[PDB]
Amino acid sequence: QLQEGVKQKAILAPQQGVTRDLKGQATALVVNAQNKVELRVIKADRVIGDKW
Amino acid sequence: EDLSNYIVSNIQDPLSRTKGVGDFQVFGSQYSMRIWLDPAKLNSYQLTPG
C-alpha cells in the first residue's frame, strides 16, 4: 500500500448516505437552508474504511 | 434511454398486471453495459478488440 499526498480540504461522506441510482451515478440527498430535500450528483474516488 | 429503462424497470410491472391490457411495446428498450473502446489505448498495450 503505497502512500502519497494529503488533501487539506477533503469531505468524507458516509457509505449509508450515498446510494447509486438506476443510471450508474452516485446520488446523495442533501437539505437546503429553506428546509427542503434536494438531490446532488456525486463522484467518489476512494474509500477509507467506512467513508467515501 | 433513461426514460425507457425507467419504463421497463418500474412502470411495466404494475401496468401489465391490470385487467384487460394486452400485449404492448415500448419506445426503445432497457439499459446495456455499453463499453467504449478507443484505438489509441488498444495500440498502447498491443491489444485488439478480439
UniProtKB/Swiss-Prot annotation, chain A:
Family affiliation: Belongs to the membrane fusion protein (MFP) (TC 8.A.1) family.
Superkingdom of origin organism: Bacteria
Reported consequences of knocking out the gene: Disruption of MexA, MexB and OprM significantly reduces active efflux of N-(3-oxododecanoyl) homoserine lactone/3-oxo-C12-HSL/PAI-1, but not N-butyryl homoserine lactone/C4-HSL/PAI-2.
Induction of the gene: By growth under severe iron limitation.
Provenance organism: Pseudomonas aeruginosa (strain ATCC 15692 / DSM 22644 / CIP 104116 / JCM 14847 / LMG 12228 / 1C / PRS 101 / PAO1)
Protein name according to UniProt: Multidrug resistance protein MexA
Subcellular location, record wording: Cell inner membrane
Additional record remark: In both X-ray crystal structures approximately the last 100 residues are not ordered.
Assembly description: Component of the MexAB-OprM multidrug efflux complex, composed of six MexA subunits forming a hexameric tube, binding to a MexB trimer, which interact with the trimeric OprM outer membrane channel protein. OprM is thought to not directly contact MexB; instead, MexA joins MexB and OprM by forming a funnel-like hexamer anchored to the inner membrane. MexA may initially form a hexameric ring complex with MexB prior to OprM, then OprM undergoes a conformational change as it contacts MexA, allowing the periplasmic gate to open.
General function of this protein: The periplasmic linker component of the MexAB-OprM efflux system that confers multidrug resistance. Functions as the major efflux pump for n-hexane and p-xylene efflux. Has been shown in one study to be involved in the active efflux of the autoinducer N-(3-oxododecanoyl) homoserine lactone, thereby playing an indirect role in quorum-sensing; but has been shown in another study not to be involved in efflux of this autoinducer. Over-expression of the pump increases antibiotic and solvent efflux capacities. Implicated in the secretion of the siderophore pyoverdine.
Effect annotated for changing residue 20 to A/D: Abolishes complex formation and thereby decreases drug resistance
UniProtKB/Swiss-Prot annotation, chain B:
Recorded family membership: Belongs to the resistance-nodulation-cell division (RND) (TC 2.A.6) family.
Induction of the gene: By growth under severe iron limitation.
Species whose genome carries this gene: Pseudomonas aeruginosa (strain ATCC 15692 / DSM 22644 / CIP 104116 / JCM 14847 / LMG 12228 / 1C / PRS 101 / PAO1)
Physiological role: The inner membrane transporter component of the MexAB-OprM efflux system that confers multidrug resistance. Functions as the major efflux pump for n-hexane and p-xylene efflux. Has been shown in one study to be involved in the active efflux of the autoinducer N-(3-oxododecanoyl) homoserine lactone, thereby playing an indirect role in quorum-sensing; but has been shown in another study not to be involved in efflux of this autoinducer. Over-expression of the pump increases antibiotic and solvent efflux capacities. Implicated in the secretion of the siderophore pyoverdine.
Other noteworthy facts: Pyridopyrimidine derivatives, such as ABI-PP, are not exported by the MexAB-OprM efflux pump, bind tightly to a MexB hydrophobic pocket and so potentiate the activities of antibiotics such as erythromycin.
Protein's cellular compartments: Cell inner membrane
Subunit field text: Component of the MexAB-OprM multidrug efflux complex, composed of six MexA subunits forming a hexameric tube, binding to a MexB trimer, which interact with the trimeric OprM outer membrane channel protein. OprM is thought to not directly contact MexB; instead, MexA joins MexB and OprM by forming a funnel-like hexamer anchored to the inner membrane. MexA may initially form a hexameric ring complex with MexB prior to OprM, then OprM undergoes a conformational change as it contacts MexA, allowing the periplasmic gate to open.
Coiled coil: none
Name assigned to this protein: Multidrug resistance protein MexB
Disruption phenotype: Disruption of MexA, MexB and OprM significantly reduces active efflux of N-(3-oxododecanoyl) homoserine lactone/3-oxo-C12-HSL/PAI-1, but not N-butyryl homoserine lactone/C4-HSL/PAI-2.
